[PDB]
Amino acid sequence: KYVDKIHIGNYEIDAWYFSPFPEDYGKQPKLWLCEYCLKYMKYEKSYRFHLGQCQWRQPPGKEIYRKSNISVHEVDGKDHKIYCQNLCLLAKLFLDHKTLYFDVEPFVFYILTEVDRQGAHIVGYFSKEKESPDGNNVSCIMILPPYQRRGYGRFLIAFSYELSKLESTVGSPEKPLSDLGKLSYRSYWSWVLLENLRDFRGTLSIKDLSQMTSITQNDIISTLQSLNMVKYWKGQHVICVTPKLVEEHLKSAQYKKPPITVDSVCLKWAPP
Ligand SMILES: O=C(NNS(=O)(=O)c1ccccc1)c1cc(-c2ccccc2)ccc1F
Ligand SMILES: [Zn+2]
Which candidate in 23, 35, 174, 248 is catalytic? 174
Q: Residue 78's closest CA among 123, 40, 130?
A: 130
The Cα–Cα gap between 20 and 144 comes to 18
Mutate to test the pocket of ligand 1, among 126, 143, 174 (most ligand atoms within 8 A of CB): 143
173 in Cβ contact with 136 (< 8 Å) = yes
Bridge partner residues of 143 (DSSP): 124
Query: For the purposes of burial, counting CB atoms within 10 Å of the CB of 99, is it exposed (0-12), middle (13-18) or buried (19 or more)?
Result: exposed
The Cα–Cα gap between 123 and 103 comes to 23
Question: Which whole-number Å values give the CA distances from 146 to 10, 28, 65, in the listed order?
Answer: 11, 23, 22
Which atom of ligand 1 lies closest to the CA of 143?
A: 22
Any ligand 1 atom below 6 A from CB of 178? yes
Q: Which ligand is nearest to the CA of 154?
A: 1
Sign of the dihedral through C-alpha 247, 251, 257, 258: positive
Would you give the distance in Å from CA 145 to the centre of its chain? 13
Question: Which whole-number Å values give the CA distances from 188 to 43, 92, 123, 213, 218, in the listed order?
Answer: 40, 24, 19, 11, 15
249 in Cβ contact with 227 (< 8 Å) = yes
Q: What is the second-level CATH architecture of the domain 185-248? A: Orthogonal Bundle (1.10)
The Cα–Cα gap between 244 and 185 comes to 24
Distance from residue 143's CA to the centre of ligand 2 (Å): 20
The Cα–Cα gap between 185 and 129 comes to 19
Ligand 1 atom 23 nearest Cα: 181
Any ligand 1 atom below 6 A from CB of 78? no
Per-residue burial over 247-267, b if 16 or more Cβ lie within 10 Å, else e, is eebbeeeeeeeeebebeeeeb
Q: Residue 32's closest CA among 41, 24, 23?
A: 41
**Is 247 known to be catalytic?**
no
Which residue type sits at 250?
L
15 in Cβ contact with 2 (< 8 Å) = yes
3-state secondary structure 143-168: ECHHHCCCCHHHHHHHHHHHHHHHCC
Distance from residue 109's CA to the centre of ligand 2 (Å): 18
Q: Which residues surround ligand 2, an ion (CB under 5 A)?
A: 34, 37, 39, 54
Resolution in A: 2.0
DSSP character string of the chain: ----EEEETTEEEE-SS-----HHHHSSS-EEE-TTT--EESSHHHHHHHHHH----S-SSEEEEEETTEEEEEEETTTSHHHHHHHHHHHHTT-SS---SS--TTEEEEEEEEEETTEEEEEEEEEEESS-TT-EEES-EEE-GGGTTTTHHHHHHHHHHHHHHHTT--BEEPSPPPHHHHHHHHHHHHHHHHHHHHH--S---HHHHHHHH-B-HHHHHHHHHHTT-EEEETTEEEE---HHHHHHHHTSGGG-SPP----GGGB-----
Which residue type sits at 49?
F
Bridge partner residues of 71 (DSSP): 66, 113
Any ligand 1 atom below 6 A from CB of 180? yes
Method: X-ray
